[PDB]
């Protein structure tokens, strides 16, 4: 889930009019646009101008040369003079810097004009303001990508000799602290800490353990397994074994290994039918249930394969997969299978339903609401929002607004990313 910059260089030829080339420039050795580069940059493109109609030049481009003359290490005025004296036919060599987001369906995007040192200074200022300036802290952190937050944390520690997460742990409280500390962890660190929390102490928070283990992919689970061992000095599988038993343990342990078959380009029609018939013969068709058979099929096959298996299953069975689970099993095991099949069939709708359940009644299941808003904000929140609005008739934004208040509400609404 990582951002990228695509730096490319392009030659652009324009015809000067009475209005000129139609853009403004900034920079120079005497007017350094940032701390380092003395380069010349396009700061604005005038509408209905030469550069605009041509469409190639972008705001933010660096001008490398004008008619073959380089704009490297020039005073601002010397660069202006190259433009003023370039004639009516002007050849530009420019450098484009294009920001690429990690996911197309995330709600939180990388910030364009990002300066980790400035953000760290501003957050320290907000922490040290009398009474704590939570608004500024929320405004910054919910409007930076997770990778940018890691860079802020690094600059903060260097400046203050304190870890940013610890400083905010001390400065904040309540649900807002929970949101902010969650946003500061990497995705694997966050999931690992949420898994540990679901198991630490007497009993188990099966709801949270199931949500994470059933919804994460092989790539996410492999990194969680690695980070969990670094953070807690034990294997995630050993903690699952410690906290669970019976068939529920078998299913959780199997899923947590992250060894599901990857999506392939070959559709295995013969296996689709055999899997569907096996699911029927293991469950609705017989007395009792062959749970190991269900576990093997539903944990080992790829997600696109299982989507087709569940459709073929309806050719054999009078009930669909979800209804069959309800009839065959119970307890933690039923809850796990139901969550898993929902994640296979439509994962954004799965999270939309969990979000609705966390708010629909008296109060709020804040732990679930926060974890989904934090963990899915850079993955598929736009699809979650679309499923939510389609099913429930009002936006996710609307439900968050009614159920939460204060700076905590503000933070969740930023992670939502907008109204629908």
């Amino acid at each position: 889930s990582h951002m990228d910059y695509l730096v490319t260089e392009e030659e652009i030829n324009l015809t000067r009019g009475p209005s000129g080339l139609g853009f403004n420039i900034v920079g120079g050795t005497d007017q350094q646009y940032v701390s380092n580069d003395s380069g010349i940059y396009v700061s604005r493109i005038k509408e209905n101008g030469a550069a605009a109609l041509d469409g190639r030049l972008q705001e933010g481009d660096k001008i490398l040369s004008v008619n073959g003359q380089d704009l490297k290490n020039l005073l601002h005025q010397d660069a202006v003079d190259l433009f003023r004296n370039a004639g009516y036919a002007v050849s530009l060599r420019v450098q484009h810097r294009l920001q690429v987001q990690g996911s197309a369906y995330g709600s939180v995007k990388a910030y364009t004009n990002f300066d980790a040192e400035r953000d760290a200074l501003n957050i320290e200022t907000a922490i040290k303001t009398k009474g704590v300036d939570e608004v500024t802290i929320v405004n910054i952190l919910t409007n930076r990508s997770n990778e940018q937050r890691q860079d802020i944390a690094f600059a903060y520690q260097r400046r203050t000799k304190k870890e940013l997460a610890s400083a905010l742990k001390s400065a904040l409280s309540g649900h807002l602290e929970t949101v902010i500390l969650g946003l500061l962890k990497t995705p694997a660190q966050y999931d690992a800490s949420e898994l540990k929390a679901s198991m630490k102490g007497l009993g188990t928070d099966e709801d949270s353990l199931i949500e994470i283990i059933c919804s994460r992919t092989n790539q996410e689970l492999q990194e969680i397994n690695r980070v969990y061992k670094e953070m807690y000095k034990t294997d995630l599988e050993k903690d699952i074994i410690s906290d669970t038993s019976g068939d529920f343990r078998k299913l959780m342990v199997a899923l947590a290994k992250g060894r599901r078959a990857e999506d392939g380009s070959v559709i295995d029609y013969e296996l689709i039918d055999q899997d569907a018939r096996d699911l029927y013969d293991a469950g609705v068709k017989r007395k009792g249930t062959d749970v190991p058979k269900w576990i093997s099929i539903m944990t080992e096959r790829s997600v696109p394969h299982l989507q087709k298996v569940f459709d073929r299953y309806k050719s054999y069975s009078p009930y669909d997969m979800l209804e069959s689970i309800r009839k065959e099993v119970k307890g933690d095991l039923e809850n796990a299978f139901l969550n898993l099949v929902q994640c296979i069939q439509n994962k954004p709708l799965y999270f939309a339903d969990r979000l609705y359940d966390s708010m629909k009644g008296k109060g709020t299941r804040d732990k679930v609401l926060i974890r989904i808003m934090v963990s899915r904000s850079e993955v598929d929140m736009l699809k979650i929002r679309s499923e939510f609005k389609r099913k429930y008739g009002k936006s996710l934004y609307y439900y968050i607004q009614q159920d939460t208040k204060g700076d905590y509400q503000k933070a969740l609404l930023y992670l939502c990313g907008g109204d629908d």
């Binding site: 403004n24 420039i25 900034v26 120079g28 007017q31 700061s43 005038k46 601002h76």
Partner: peptide, 6 residues
């Protein structure tokens, strides 16, 4: 911060 029209 000088911004110059060209």
């Amino acid at each position: 911060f000088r911004e110059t029209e060209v």
